[PDB]
Swiss-Prot record, chains A, B:
Binding site for Zn(2+) 1: H95, H223
Lineage: Bacteria, Bacillati, Actinomycetota, Actinomycetes, Mycobacteriales
NCBIfam families given in the database record: cbbA, FruBisAldo_II_A, PRK09197.1
A Pfam family it matches: F_bP_aldolase
Keywords, comma-separated and alphabetical: Glycolysis, Lyase, Metal-binding, Zinc
InterPro entries the UniProt entry points to: Aldolase_TIM, FBA_II, Fruct_bisP_bact
Residues annotated as the enzyme's active site: D94 (proton donor)
Function: Catalyzes the aldol condensation of dihydroxyacetone phosphate (DHAP or glycerone-phosphate) with glyceraldehyde 3-phosphate (G3P) to form fructose 1,6-bisphosphate (FBP) in gluconeogenesis and the reverse reaction in glycolysis.
Record's cofactor remark: Binds 2 Zn(2+) ions per subunit. One is catalytic and the other provides a structural contribution.
GO cellular component labels: cytosol
Class of the enzyme per the UniProt entry, highest EC level: lyase
Protein name: Fructose-bisphosphate aldolase
GO biological process, alphabetically ordered: glycolytic process
Length: 314, 314
């Protein structure tokens, strides 16, 4: 099943507490969605699927080029497929800069807010506001009003600040609270390395809130997950990193067999020397199955790398 | 938008009255569904997308392998997307044999039956029963109960009988009627070529019903529509072919640009000689946009060849 807001939060809670993180796979089609979910399930693990603005535009198709239709289209498809797997999958929307709030995140927020007022769950379980490229102040201002929308729509907001400053973590707590006005995830800039910036950010916020020095007020997000060194990732997990984006590596694992298929069956996927090709290899499923299954093998590898393998709530 | 049953019958009606037919494009994923619809709207045509048992199993993913899940999932996807287009798009399932009636055709009829008792429309507008491999007597007995169920979900039923003899057309009329028991499409055997077999079935049929000689009681479908001849097609259209399945040709169009992309961008989709590849060209979207546009062009061609281009009812 797709994750309800309650299991999503339980998912993030249980990961924060036992120091593992969820892989969040960017997907741009039913094939790749299917590969990610199959990967998670295979690693007896819950997981997260995300739609980037680019990937959602691609999803609405070349004749539509509309992120919101793209996202909703894909999510609807994902709801039907999720139901047939035992693990829980959270739908998330990825990097959305300021100039795209009115045509991506705000529209989607209104869609879920509408579903929630009818007594249903929201379409997506989290959305990212990316204000990394504007003054931390202006970022937190906007973050504030999006957080009220998100929380109303039972959705977790993710935000990105800015090496991030100790004063930045303070400003963030001041502005957003630490969950009482809506749960939210934090992506800080620590060399994406310097994972100890995150450890520092956690004490700093604990001091300010008046909690024990071991308390972890933030749930962190790790951008720059692909191509990474186990040691650094292990350390980051201890400091409360709960979600790690994997995009580039699941792309290569997905394309690599297609490439292979094309070369080895060159004179069968192409009509060469007056011949008519071999239909069993230019059938998209012949290589798209290889692609999907290759992406599921990589996705499994990530659930082992973030130790969420085998830890599915269900 | 998706064709309601009313518009769907209105489409086929007009196509019969004016001797054109619609391409019915086989689809297996979100990319192919977007290509097909974009093709129709470029061609200014209404159109048909259909999911075979094999592609619908492919749509549910390597980790579910279930026809019904894949048909529903891909169908909810198409409902969202078709809403953005001004042409009517009907959803059809393809070739379903006796031993797959229970795991494909019937549970889908059930889903739409429930949907229609609540005030709305069926999920699909037409469903195929392929009994070509059983004796016409048994073929038609099963057709009769399916047609009861199909007409109750406001659904058009397609059937295949078996060269089809004058006697088989008479039987078919005797068992199903000519519309008073709900509407159905007929695929007959005639070398798929001898399109004159179809004219014969129209005469035979028209005579049994005391309708005009030149009547056209049957709505015929044309399987084996790829690698066909542009004069075979014209004749068939005169005799009431309203729907021609294209699969092989749109498959090759999809795969062709993917293959070329891999070969030309070889040292970018592979990591070769210590290099790390180019992310711009092993990003799945890069070459699936090509594939999708190529497939759309083939669809515009089929629309042109079948004379449904520019004849959308909206
Ligand atoms: Na069928
Ligand atoms: Na068919």
């Amino acid at each position: 099943p797709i994750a309800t807001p309650e299991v999503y939060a339980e998912m993030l809670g249980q990961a924060k507490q036992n120091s593992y993180a969820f892989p969040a796979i960017n997907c741009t089609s039913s094939e790749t969605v299917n590969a990610a979910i199959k990967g998670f399930a295979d690693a007896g693990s819950d997981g997260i699927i995300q739609f980037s603005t680019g990937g959602a535009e691609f999803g609405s198709g070349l004749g539509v080029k509309d992120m919101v239709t793209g996202a909703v289209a894909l999510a609807e498809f994902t709801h039907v497929i999720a139901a047939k797997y035992p693990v829980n999958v959270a739908l998330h929307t990825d990097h959305c800069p300021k100039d795209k709030l009115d045509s991506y995140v705000r529209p989607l927020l209104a869609i879920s807010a509408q579903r929630v007022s009818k007594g249903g769950n929201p379409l997506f379980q989290s959305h990212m506001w990316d204000g990394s490229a504007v003054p931390i102040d202006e970022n937190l201002a906007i973050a504030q009003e999006l957080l009220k929308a998100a929380a109303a729509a039972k959705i977790i907001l993710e935000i990105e600040i800015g090496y991030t400053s100790p004063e930045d973590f303070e400003k963030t707590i001041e502005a957003l609270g630490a969950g009482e006005h809506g749960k939210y995830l934090l992506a800080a800039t620590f060399g994406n390395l310097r994972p100890d910036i995150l450890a520092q950010g956690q004490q700093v916020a604990a001091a300010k809130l008046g909690l024990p020095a071991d308390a972890k007020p933030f749930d962190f997000v790790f951008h720059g997950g692909s191509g990474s060194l186990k040691s650094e990732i292990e350390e980051a997990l201890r400091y409360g990193v709960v979600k790690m984006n994997v995009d580039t590596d699941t792309q290569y694992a997905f394309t690599r067999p297609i490439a292979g298929h094309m070369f080895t069956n060159y004179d069968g996927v192409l009509k060469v020397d007056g011949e008519v090709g071999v239909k069993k290899v230019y059938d998209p499923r012949s290589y798209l199955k290889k692609a999907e299954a290759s992406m599921s093998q990589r996705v499994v590898q990530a659930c082992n790398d973030l130790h969420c393998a085998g830890k599915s709530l269900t």
